[PDB]
Amino acid sequence: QRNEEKAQREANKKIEKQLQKDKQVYRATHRLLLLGAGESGKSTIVKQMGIFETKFQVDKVNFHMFDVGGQRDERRKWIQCFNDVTAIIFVVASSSYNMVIDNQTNRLQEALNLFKSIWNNRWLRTISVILFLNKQDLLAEKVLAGKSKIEDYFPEFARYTTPEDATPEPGEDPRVTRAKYFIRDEFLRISTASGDGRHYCYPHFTCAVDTENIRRVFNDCRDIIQRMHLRQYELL
Amino acid sequence: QARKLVEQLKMEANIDRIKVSKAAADLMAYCEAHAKEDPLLTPVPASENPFR
Amino acid sequence: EVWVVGMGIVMSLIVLAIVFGNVLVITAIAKFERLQTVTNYFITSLACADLVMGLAVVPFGAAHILTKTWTFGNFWCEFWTSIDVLCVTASIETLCVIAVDRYFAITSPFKYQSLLTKNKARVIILMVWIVSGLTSFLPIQMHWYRATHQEAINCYAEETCCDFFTNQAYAIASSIVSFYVPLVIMVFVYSRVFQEAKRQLQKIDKSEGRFHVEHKALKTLGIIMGTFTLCWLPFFIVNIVHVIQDNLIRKEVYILLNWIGYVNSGFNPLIYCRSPDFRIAFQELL
Amino acid sequence: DQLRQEAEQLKNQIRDARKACADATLSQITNNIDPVGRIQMRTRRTLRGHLAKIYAMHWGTDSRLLVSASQDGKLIIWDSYTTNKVHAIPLRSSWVMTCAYAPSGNYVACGGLDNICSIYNLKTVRVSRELAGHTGYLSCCRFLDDNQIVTSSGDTTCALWDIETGQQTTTFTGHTGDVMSLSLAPDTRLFVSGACDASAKLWDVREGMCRQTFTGHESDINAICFFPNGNAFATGSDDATCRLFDLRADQELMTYSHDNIICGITSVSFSKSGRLLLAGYDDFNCNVWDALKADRAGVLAGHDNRVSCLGVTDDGMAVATGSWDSFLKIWN
Numbered sequence A: 001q002r003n004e005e006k007a008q009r010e011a012n013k014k015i016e017k018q019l020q021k022d023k024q025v026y027r028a029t030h031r032l033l034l035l036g037a038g039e040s041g042k043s044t045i046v047k048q049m050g051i052f053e054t055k056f057q058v059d060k061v062n063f064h065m066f067d068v069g070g071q072r073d074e075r076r077k078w079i080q081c082f083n084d085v086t087a088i089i090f091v092v093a094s095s096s097y098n099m100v101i102d103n104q105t106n107r108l109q110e111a112l113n114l115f116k117s118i119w120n121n122r123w124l125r126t127i128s129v130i131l132f133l134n135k136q137d138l139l140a141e142k143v144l145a146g147k148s149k150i151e152d153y154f155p156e157f158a159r160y161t162t163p164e165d166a167t168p169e170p171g172e173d174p175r176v177t178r179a180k181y182f183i184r185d186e187f188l189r190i191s192t193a194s195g196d197g198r199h200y201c202y203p204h205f206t207c208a209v210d211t212e213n214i215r216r217v218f219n220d221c222r223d224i225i226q227r228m229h230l231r232q233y234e235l236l
Numbered sequence B: 001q002a003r004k005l006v007e008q009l010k011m012e013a014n015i016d017r018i019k020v021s022k023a024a025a026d027l028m029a030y031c032e033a034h035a036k037e038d039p040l041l042t043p044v045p046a047s048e049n050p051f052r
Numbered sequence C: 001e002v003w004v005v006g007m008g009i010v011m012s013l014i015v016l017a018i019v020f021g022n023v024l025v026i027t028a029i030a031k032f033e034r035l036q037t038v039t040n041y042f043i044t045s046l047a048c049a050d051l052v053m054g055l056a057v058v059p060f061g062a063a064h065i066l067t068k069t070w071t072f073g074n075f076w077c078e079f080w081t082s083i084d085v086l087c088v089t090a091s092i093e094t095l096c097v098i099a100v101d102r103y104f105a106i107t108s109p110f111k112y113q114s115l116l117t118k119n120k121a122r123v124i125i126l127m128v129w130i131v132s133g134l135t136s137f138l139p140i141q142m143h144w145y146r147a148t149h150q151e152a153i154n155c156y157a158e159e160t161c162c163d164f165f166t167n168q169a170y171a172i173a174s175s176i177v178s179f180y181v182p183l184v185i186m187v188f189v190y191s192r193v194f195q196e197a198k199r200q201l202q203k204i205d206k207s208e209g210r211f212h213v214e215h216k217a218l219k220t221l222g223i224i225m226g227t228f229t230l231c232w233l234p235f236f237i238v239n240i241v242h243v244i245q246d247n248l249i250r251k252e253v254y255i256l257l258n259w260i261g262y263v264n265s266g267f268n269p270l271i272y273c274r275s276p277d278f279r280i281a282f283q284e285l286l
Numbered sequence D: 001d002q003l004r005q006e007a008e009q010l011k012n013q014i015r016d017a018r019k020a021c022a023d024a025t026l027s028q029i030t031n032n033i034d035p036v037g038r039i040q041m042r043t044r045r046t047l048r049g050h051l052a053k054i055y056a057m058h059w060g061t062d063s064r065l066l067v068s069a070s071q072d073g074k075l076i077i078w079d080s081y082t083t084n085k086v087h088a089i090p091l092r093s094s095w096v097m098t099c100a101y102a103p104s105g106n107y108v109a110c111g112g113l114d115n116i117c118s119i120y121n122l123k124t125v126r127v128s129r130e131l132a133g134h135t136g137y138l139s140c141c142r143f144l145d146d147n148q149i150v151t152s153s154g155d156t157t158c159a160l161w162d163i164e165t166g167q168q169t170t171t172f173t174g175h176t177g178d179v180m181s182l183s184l185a186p187d188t189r190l191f192v193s194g195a196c197d198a199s200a201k202l203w204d205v206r207e208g209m210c211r212q213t214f215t216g217h218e219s220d221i222n223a224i225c226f227f228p229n230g231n232a233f234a235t236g237s238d239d240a241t242c243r244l245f246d247l248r249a250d251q252e253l254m255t256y257s258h259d260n261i262i263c264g265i266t267s268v269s270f271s272k273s274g275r276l277l278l279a280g281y282d283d284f285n286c287n288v289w290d291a292l293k294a295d296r297a298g299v300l301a302g303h304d305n306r307v308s309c310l311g312v313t314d315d316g317m318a319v320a321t322g323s324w325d326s327f328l329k330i331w332n
C-alpha cells in the first residue's frame, strides 16, 4: 500500500536528480551537423577538427559534431531530427566545377541543389549553415591552367565581375580570386533570397593545409547564438 | 530484376476479394457490437475513471 | 466639482489599465507552460510588483488626493507608504535585473546557458525583493525615515493628514538604491548590447553587402530606456532636490512627478510583452 | 521490355478487379448510422522530465506503464496512474526514432539514426542485445513476443529478428522506399508497413512473403495502424489525407481529410471499438476522426510543437500524445 508509493516516490526523486544532472551537461553542449557532398571534405575536416559522432572542445566550450554516415538517400527524412542543432556545417568541393560525378552537371549544381533543399526545408527554417569551400588549392590550380574553362560549365561566369568590396588573399592570382568569389556568390545568392533574418550562411574558403577551422567554427557558432539572441528581442 | 517484380504481381493477383458492401457491413457490425466497451466513445464515470 | 470628477476618472482609468495589464501578463505566464522561461520569471516578478502597486498605492493615493485627508489610521499611512516604496524599488530593480540578463545573453552566449538557470532565477528574484523590503519596510515601519522640522512632526502627530516628510539621508539612500544605481547599470548594459548589435549589423553588411538581404536597435533601445527614464528621472531628481533645498520643490509638483512615475507600471507590459508568443497568448486568452 | 509490359498488364488487371469488387462506398452504408457527436477531451495527466523533443512512445499490456523515447538520449518509463518515472535508461546514441514495450512487460527496445537496434532488459537495466544488420535508420519496432522483434529501417527492407540468436530470421524485401512505420496485427500472423512511396504493403510473418499492396495515397506514409478487428488499417500520409484500407476488399474504403488543414499526419491510432481514428498532425493540434463516417468528432490541442507520437491503451481508457514539446499529455 504505502510502501509502494514510498518506493515510487524515492525512485522518482533519484531519477529527477539524475535528469537535472544530465540537463546541466545537455544545455551546455552544442550539436553540429556535418552534411555535404560525401566525396569531398568529410575526411579532411573531421581529422582537422551508421553515424559518426566526434566531440571537440575549444575555449572550454563543448561542441559535438555528427556525421550522417554517408547513407545514400536522395530524400532526407532523417534531416527533421536535426531541427534543434546549433548549426549545419556544409562542405563543398569548390575545385569540382568541371568534374561530372548518370552524372550531374558538375557536382556543383548538385551541391547547389543540396544547399537549396537544406535551406528551404520546413524543419530547418531557423538553423544557420556554416559553409566550407574545401580543396581551395586544387581550384586555384585548375583556374591557373587553361585546360578547363569555368564559363563553359557555368554560363553566368562570362558576365560575372569581381566585387569591389572584397578581401583577396595576400598572394593570389586575379583569375583564382574571381572564380572563388563566383563560387561563393552562387551559394550566397541561394542563401540570402529564401532567408528572412532567422538563419544566415557563413562562407569560408578553407584548405586541407589550414588547421584553424576549429576556431572558425567556434566563431561562427558564437555569431549564430548572438544573432539568435539579438533577433529574439526586437533588436537587430 | 523485373522478373521478381512481375512474379510478385502475378502472385498478388491470384487472390479473392469480397464485395465492398460485405466489408463495410462487417466493420459496421464490429463497431456497433463493441461500442459499449469503448471508454473514449462513451466516457466512464469519474469513480470508474482511473486517471481522473 | 467638474475638475474633481475628471481627476477621479483619470485615476480610475490609470488603475484599471495597470491592473488589467498586470493580471493579463501574469495569467499568460501562469497558464501556458511554453511561456515559462528564465527571463519570463523576471517578467513575472516585475508584473507582480506592478500589480501590487496598482492594487494598493494607486487607489489609496487617489482617494487621499481626492479627499484631501487620510481617513484611515496612522498605521495604515505608514503601511501604504512602505508598500509604495516596496513597489517602486522592486519594479525598478527588476527592470535592472532584466537588463543585466539580456546583457549576459548577448554578450556571453556560450556561458549564458550555465550562468543563468531556472533555480538561480528564483534566488535572484528573492534577493531583489529582499533588498526592496529592507529599503522599504525596515526604515518606514521602524520609524527611521521621519524628519524633525515643525511641519513634519505636526503632520506625524495628527492622524488626519498622511503626507511624506523624510530625512535627507534616507531620501538620498532610497533614491540611490531604487533608481540611480539601476539606471547606471541599465545604461551600461544597454550601451554594450547596442554596440554588439551594431557590430553584428556591420558583419552582416560585410558578408552580404552586395545583395539586399541600426534603426531597429535604436528604436527598441529608445522604447526600453526613454519610457523608464522619462517616467522616473524627474521624480527622483526632485526627490533629491527637495531635501537638498527646503523651499525649492512644491508639494503639487512632487505628487505630479510621483504619479508620472507611477504610470510606468502600466507602461511596462507594453514594452516588455511585445513578443509574438505573448501576443498569441493574449489573443487566445481574450 | 516484355516483362515491363506483363507487369503493366497485371497492374491493369488488378485495378479492373478492384473496380469490379467496388459496389458501394463505406459512406453509403454508414449514412444511416447516427454520428458520435462532439467529443470533449481534456488532459488528465501531463508527463514532464524529457530534456529534448519526444519522437515515439508505446503503451504497455497493462495501461499503467508506458515508455517514451527522446532525442536527448533518454528512454524514460513512466507510471501513468501515479505520474512517476519507474525507470530512466541512458542511450548510446542520442538520436532515437522508435521505441517498443514488450507484451511480456520485461523488455524494451529502441532504435534510431544508428543502424543498431538495442533491446533493454527491465527486470534483472542493461542492453540485453544489440541487433545489427540494417543499412539505414530504424523507424518503428514492435514485439511479436518476448523473443521475436520486427523492425523497419531506412533501407527498403524490413526484417524479423530473433533475440536469442541476434540474427535476422527472415527479411521482407521487395519494397521501393524508406519504411517509416509498421504495425502488428492483433494476431501475430500478419503485419503491414507504410513508407515514403505511396504504397503500403501487407506482409506474412511466418512465410515471409508479401501478400497485398495498397497505393491509395499521393505522398509518403508516416503512420499506420490496424483496425481492432484486424481486417483493416488506416494510414497517415505526409499530405493532409488520412485513409482507411481493407484487407479483404484490397482497396481504400474512406478518406479522412479537410480543406482547412494542409499539414501532414505523423501518428495514427484507433480506439478500442474502432469507431474513433485518433490521428496526430504536423499542426500543433491533434484530430479525432469518426472512422465510419469521416466526420471530425473532437480536436486534441495543447501541444506547443508538432505531435510525433500517439497511442491508445489496450482497455481504451487513455490516449497519450508525444509532441516535439517535451511533454506526454494523457487524454481521456
Ligand SMILES: CN[C@@H]1CCc2c(ccc(O)c2O)[C@H]1O
Binding pocket: C081, C084, C085, C088, C089, C164, C171, C174, C175, C178, C239, C258
Ligand atoms: C510616498 N511616495 C514615495 C516617497 C519617496 C520614494 C518613493 C518611491 C521610491 C523611493 O525610493 C522613495 O524614496 C515615493 O513613491
